[PDB]
Design a protein around this ligand. Sequence first.
Ligand SMILES: Cc1cc2nc3c(=O)[nH]c(=O)nc-3n(C[C@H](O)[C@H](O)[C@H](O)COP(=O)(O)OP(=O)(O)OC[C@H]3O[C@@H](n4cnc5c(N)ncnc54)[C@H](O)[C@@H]3O)c2cc1C
Ligand SMILES: NC(=O)c1ccc[n+]([C@@H]2O[C@H](COP(=O)([O-])OP(=O)(O)OC[C@H]3O[C@@H](n4cnc5c(N)ncnc54)[C@H](OP(=O)(O)O)[C@@H]3O)[C@@H](O)[C@H]2O)c1
Length: 628
Amino acid sequence: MLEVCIIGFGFSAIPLVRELARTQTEFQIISAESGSVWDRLSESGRLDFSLVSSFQTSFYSFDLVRDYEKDYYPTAKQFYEMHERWRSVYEEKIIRDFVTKIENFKDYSLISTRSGKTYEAKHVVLATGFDRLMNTFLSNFDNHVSNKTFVFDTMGDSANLLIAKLIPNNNKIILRTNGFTALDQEVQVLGKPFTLDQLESPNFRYVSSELYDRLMMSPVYPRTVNPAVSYNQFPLIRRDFSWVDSKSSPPNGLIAIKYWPIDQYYYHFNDDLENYISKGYLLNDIAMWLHTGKVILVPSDTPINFDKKTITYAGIERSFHQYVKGDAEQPRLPTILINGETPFEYLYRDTFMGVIPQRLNNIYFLGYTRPFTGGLANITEMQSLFIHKLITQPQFHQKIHQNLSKRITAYNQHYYGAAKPRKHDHTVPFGFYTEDIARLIGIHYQPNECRSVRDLLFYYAFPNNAFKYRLKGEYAVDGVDELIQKVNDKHDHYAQVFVQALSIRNMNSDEAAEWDHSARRFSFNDMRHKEGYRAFLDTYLKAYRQVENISVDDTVVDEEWNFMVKEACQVRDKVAPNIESKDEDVNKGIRLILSILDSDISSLPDAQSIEFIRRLLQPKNYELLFIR
Ligand SMILES: Cc1cc2nc3c(=O)[nH]c(=O)nc-3n(C[C@H](O)[C@H](O)[C@H](O)COP(=O)(O)OP(=O)(O)OC[C@H]3O[C@@H](n4cnc5c(N)ncnc54)[C@H](O)[C@@H]3O)c2cc1C
Ligand SMILES: NC(=O)c1ccc[n+]([C@@H]2O[C@H](COP(=O)([O-])OP(=O)(O)OC[C@H]3O[C@@H](n4cnc5c(N)ncnc54)[C@H](OP(=O)(O)O)[C@@H]3O)[C@@H](O)[C@H]2O)c1
């Protein structure tokens, strides 16, 4: 009887399929003829955008190993192209069919398809993706509507992608939301560009949750009164975070819009604008939108009749052309029958690590955990290794499953606490998830096993990407030592990250928040590096309109909008005139570290930071009750 059935093959499943081939496990893939959202975007011609995520975190270790020279943002085209390549390799093993039902028994499951064909499989893996409502807007659109008005009850990376495509057609944007978390996807660090994922040094949570919290959460929670931070100038972006009942920060369930800030966007693309836009590099700067008023925030309770289709803001009644609601992070699970009769009720919190469900035998989920920053690759690679070991190594299987529900309770206690289940429970800091998975599999690193400060940087500051845990051990990939050398050598061994955590070791949360924003340009939501790009923005529009064959008649006065903008930006007009250090501390920190790279750690004698750097071999907060 068939050992393994993979239902659905897009991207999530590639690494697990690679691992099955390797160990020569008997597997079949069943996967729809239609394909995914991407084959949509391929047919309609709509691949004209780029990922919010860096190569290093969006593409799998066994590709990075040969294609990685420098950090870039891949295009939707490059990402689709990489799916069709791995599709091609495995097409012989793929059955084109839709599965409509799985009857799960003690030893195996019975898979029904639309064809009517039936399959028996010992283990089954669902890698079927999500149904998403804005896919419609993204797959089906028209860049001919201009000067119209749009209301969004929700903000997110797809809402942001659509706002990027509207603004050049002098469309007017209103966000009627309960606020949102948005973060510069790229950060100038002493001249060098870093992705946001590259600066989280997540293993610092082991030193203390509180150390990590104040290092991490100042751009999210409004803990600075610095009037350059969008959350002080535009207080409507603020969310209620009272649901958060966990010592883990950032908390599971936190989501974030990743945007290009204009200055980073300038730096990368100014010298060949028409081509870079052509390729799908699009200015999606929400902070710039808020500052120009090409977008405006509005209280959530700003009533409107959907029937007359108008918006009640200030002493104005603006007729809106389109209202956009959107939230469908619901996995595409076909019906699953327990003991082959009782329907299975999906709930992210009731599965272990987002992969192991509780009343089902030999059934795995792959592609349903959402990384909070970085690409899905990071998550799906480690899921792939966790699932492969569970399928192929029955002692491992027994170890996890013995006390499956104790692990799930202990997981939920650490990450969610007492909070009621939410839509976004399935979102997680990637740096915690990957480390979590790796300590279950045992391909993790020991801090006690560091001998040099160089080793202490690898452990704490090297980002917890999937390939990080594939240098050696059970899942070692050829060429990973070279990747780590490459990357290490390009980011100064992630010293700057290590130095941050050091700098804020003695501060309280309010002290850290201030320090974190005492920079000429702080990392996230810095409204001082906006005004001086209005000249460039004008280039960008003209430039955009050329590749995309647009005329917009740009002398028009939406006079009421100009007055809606003025009322919206009130707090701004009060607070931004109050304008006027991490830069220095970091400058001297990097000095100390790059000098003592090769010093034995235990040897270290007794700026008094050396004593904390010793204690880095023996962290207090390593305990994870869901792993032991
Ligand atoms: C606009 C957009 C932008 C994104 N950008 C990024 C990004 O920048 N970085 C990043 O890391 N992630 C990104 N993602 C998320 C991720 O890359 C996608 O979800 C991608 O589709 C990988 O998903 P998957 O392999 O899990 O599922 P899919 O690509 O949906 O593949 C699942 C497959 O299962 C098939 N299938 C489903 N149900 C059945 C069934 N019952 N029987 C048989 N076959 C079935 C489907 O046809 C499909 O081919 C983005 C997603 C979207 C929509
Ligand atoms: N690696 C990845 O998988 C990855 C990463 C980023 C983006 N993406 C893609 O981009 C899209 C995700 O964005 P989306 O626009 O589709 O919807 P979404 O961001 O998943 O949902 C957004 C809505 O959730 C609610 N919400 C709760 N907490 C929030 C917070 N802190 N910030 C913002 N919103 C919050 C808000 O509405 P209420 O206030 O009404 O509850 C908000 O409007 C998907 O297509 C996804 O595949 C993928």
